[PDB]
Symmetry: D3
Subunit: 157 residues, 6 copies
């Protein structure tokens, strides 16, 4: 059983690590798929986000980190994944995820959308909040893998 | 009885067609009003959106398609419309629509805001989602009138 | 020509309901304020009391008729030759319930249109249930009710 | 190898539940459709009826077993050697309740994963409660139920 | 000088309530933890038990007094010379109910301010109702309760 | 007891006045803190927003208006404020405020986040809605202090 976990991951946080870790305990192979996501004008390049997520997930033996610009339902099919994973935190995410799941079902009905809820520890954070706290000299070491915190400090310096 | 259904309609989808069709069964005359909406930086010009909505609603004999840049409550008064129609899909739309309706009531208390819910078929789509799926080579023929799908493919080509 | 029903429990009818039915009278030639005879939740006021209160409170509106009903609200609309069913929307909890109700009514009677109206900001944070509970705890609810309803609620709570 | 439980009241099982359990069968080797013996709210159908209806309605799915349970759903998953607990998500009210349920199940059994599936748009606005109430008010609910459930609900309401 | 009331059913008081009342003690000179004598929903614990549990659980906080009340919470605040009414906010369902409650309390007592506090993430997914139901189904709830409450809940469920 | 009420206040509305007025009745000293907030690309400069909020709150003897670009939890500590006030209107605000409060608690656990609900009169407005209504020649005199309405008309002229 193969699952894909697609997202912008700009940068990957402990909330994303929590989700991908739970996914590795349920599936034989997990593809952590990083979208180029130019409409979000990311802080980190796609190559930087892939290297960061690779170093942050290296302790999980069945995780493969890749980048993509394709329609996520096509990319799942190309990874031979029958499950597409998304984390669920808040009501805003839930409404967006319902639209995304129904569209993905229309495009690839054999691809199952599965939702996981992160630890309470990460239920009130996002990459966007973390970046803004760090932009204002707020400490975010608790929310990010060590290598990601280093890269975020380096990018803002 | 005259109603106006104002929106960006960038582009008009089957969800909007569903709403305007239900409106034609309740009112003698429906004005489908397309806002120039420059703050949304639309994909299609106002002239293109009016021509698209005109061709998509031509089978409804009591629909008139017009463009506007005015305050929507003034534009309703100018069309001699006593009803302003808006579609309701999700919680996010509902909160926004509550603010819009209360402001419109403050500006024109004799203008009644009326809400319609689209078919379940269109309850998980928006113009923005459709455009992004199409931008990533995803098929959206099911969500749009034929002429609109043609124009969207032509614009992205 | 255009006929609409406005169904509910109205236990009792509040100024929020009056606001909704008044706006409906400006849009439709005839409005039937439809009172649920037997909701699953036992009402404080009997059907006869709820109908009498709603009639007195809407007597100034010439195109409203108050009628009791025990059937499917979609069947009641059809029997009343009403092609529009009106519901008021106040909050997110109302919205989710109204979405289920509207999609079900559409499956039952696809020719019946559900329309939603929003009440004044004045009545957007009240319900019949909140008003009854405040009055039971001896709180001032005069502002939220028609005069006759305020009289009936005081009399009911006194005994 | 991978085992999942899908717990609920299923009073009665609807096409929304069938949709969820069918999708779960495509992801897991074995799925236990787990029926709550004694919910706090008295069910319309007894446990024996709910189990018989769910069995007949899932008989075409080879890797589903229908089982009644009265314990903590997290304890039931562990006793069934299931490391995944499935729940369907339809609306915002479901989401808030499911968040409380999932965080509690994680405190009780941290090795048990809660997974969420979304049903077809066709079943996203129904519930067993809405379907029962529509049928009690003599409304057509055939579209929302497996054939055997539609037969059982008609028979129950007739008497 | 500044006095606040923190009203609720507290059936029983949880670590979520302790979190809220502790934060209130840091902001106000005197905090009255106000326990509802007769809620519409019958409590598991009697008023005497809920007051005794809340007193023992807040005994380390020097500026808290636990008091039972049966009146309008806005009237209770005024009689206690409290110009602030505290409520905890966890989720969207709490938010909608609290909005209705705050606007009503403002109509009843405009000089009374409603303030909202958010509990720790640790207690953001629990309620007294969830905790009681988990304990009734023999689940471990020790982490969510003060020691004395955990003792009282075990004793109540044993008989 | 000292409280801070931080925000963009672009411009300050009657909803914000309502909140700061309620805060003055609970605390000995209230600091109304205006964030430079460049990510929101404000309509008014920080200096203009401070002068507007100063004139609009001059009748409240225990209000001090200041500007800031710092992390709001640090700025609260620097004002010797132990309470950070935020207004709550809708579900969208509530979810955002929950994330903000939990992050502020992580950064400054001794700083208490307190929420106030505005009058029903202001529960359906925002600075953004008011500006857009005014941009479309809609009258917004009811929603703003007199001096703010003058400055908004002057800026759009
Ligand atoms: C409910 O979703 C909405 C609602 C309103 C507007 C836009 C959206 C979506 N963000 C639109 N994008 C969709 C929709 C669907 C169904 N399939 C999609 N495939 C992609 N692929 C891109 C690849 C790149 N670069 C992408 C971008 C960001 C994140 C991801 Cl995980 C993937 N985007 N995409
Ligand atoms: C709840 O609404 C919010 C909340 C926060 C920020 C902004 C808004 C609104 N989008 C602000 N715009 C408002 C508010 C009101 C009351 N009347 C308005 N009349 C118009 N007319 C323009 C005409 C053009 N071009 C327009 C633009 C897009 C769509 C439409 Cl239908 C109309 N805009 N407009
Ligand atoms: C979204 O609604 C839910 C969700 C979950 C459970 C139950 C419900 C509904 N209250 C179930 N009842 C429905 C659904 C539908 C589609 N049509 C209905 N027609 C009636 N008619 C009765 C007549 C009487 N006495 C009634 C009862 C109370 C209020 C009214 Cl306005 C009308 N009830 N009814
Ligand atoms: C978020 O949930 C809330 C929120 C507020 C109050 C009550 C609840 C829950 N309904 C309380 N019950 C919980 C919570 C947890 C964590 N584990 C549970 N295991 C069970 N097992 C029973 C077995 C029986 N008969 C049951 C009852 C009804 C439905 C099901 Cl699927 C299972 N109940 N139960
Ligand atoms: C938004 O609230 C709703 C919405 C719908 C229905 C009912 C309610 C409320 N529970 C109705 N009750 C209200 C409203 C108001 C404004 N003031 C009130 N004062 C009280 N006092 C009693 C005293 C006793 N025993 C009480 C009961 C339970 C909990 C508490 Cl904290 C206090 N109740 N009460
Ligand atoms: C839930 O919050 C989210 C969620 C997603 C993305 C972004 C955010 C926040 N807007 C991120 N900003 C945060 C978070 C935190 C915890 N502390 C912060 N301190 C500041 N200071 C700036 C100073 C300036 N100029 C500011 C900007 C606008 C308004 C204010 Cl009141 C303050 N910003 N800031």
């Amino acid at each position: 059983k193969r699952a894909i976990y697609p997202g912008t991951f700009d940068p990957i946080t402990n909330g994303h690590i929590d989700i991908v870790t739970r996914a590795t305990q349920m599936f034989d192979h997990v593809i952590l798929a990083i979208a180029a996501s130019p409409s979000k004008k990311p802080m980190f390049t796609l190559e930087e986000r892939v290297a960061l997520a690779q170093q942050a997930t290296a302790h999980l033996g069945n995780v493969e980190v890749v980048g993509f610009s394709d329609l996520m339902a096509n990319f799942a099919r190309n990874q031979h994944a029958t499950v597409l994973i998304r984390g669920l935190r808040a009501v805003a995410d839930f409404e967006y995820e319902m639209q995304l799941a129904h569209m993905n079902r229309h495009l690839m009905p054999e691809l199952e959308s599965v939702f996981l809820m992160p630890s309470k520890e990460w239920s009130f954070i996002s990459s966007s909040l973390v970046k803004e706290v760090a932009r204002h000299q707020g400490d975010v070491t608790h929310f990010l893998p060590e290598n990601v915190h280093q890269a975020l400090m380096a990018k803002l310096a």
